[PDB]
Amino acid sequence: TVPKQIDIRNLIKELRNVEGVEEVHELHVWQLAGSRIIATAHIKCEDPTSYMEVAKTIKDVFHNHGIHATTIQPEFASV
């Protein structure tokens, strides 16, 4: 039941590559017992509206690595 943090190749690159994603930090990928991988990340975006637009794309990036449960914290640009 004790989770172990793994390091998926290219994941952060693909995330940084998503249109609308201005920066990525605090990416964590965990192996829960019984094969279930989850991930969290903080993502910088222009504003709340842009986040709504890119949330799906981000989730797809994770889904491409077989990851179905994510928690993404958006942080927003500050003029």
Under the binding rule (CB under 5 A), the answer on residue 42 touching Zn ion is yes
Nearest approach in angstroms of CB 11 to a second copy is 15
Under the binding rule (CB under 8 A), the answer on residue 12 touching a second copy is no
Query: HSE on the CB side for 76, CA within 13 Å?
Result: 7
Q: In Å, how far are 27, 41, 51, 67, 78 from 70, measured between CA atoms?
A: 11, 8, 15, 7, 25
Find the part of the chain contacting Zn ion (CB under 5 A) among 5-13, 27-35, 40-48, 49-57: 40-48
- Name the binder of 32 from a second copy, Zn ion, none, CB < 5-8 A by kind: a second copy
- Encoded tokens for 31: 């192996």
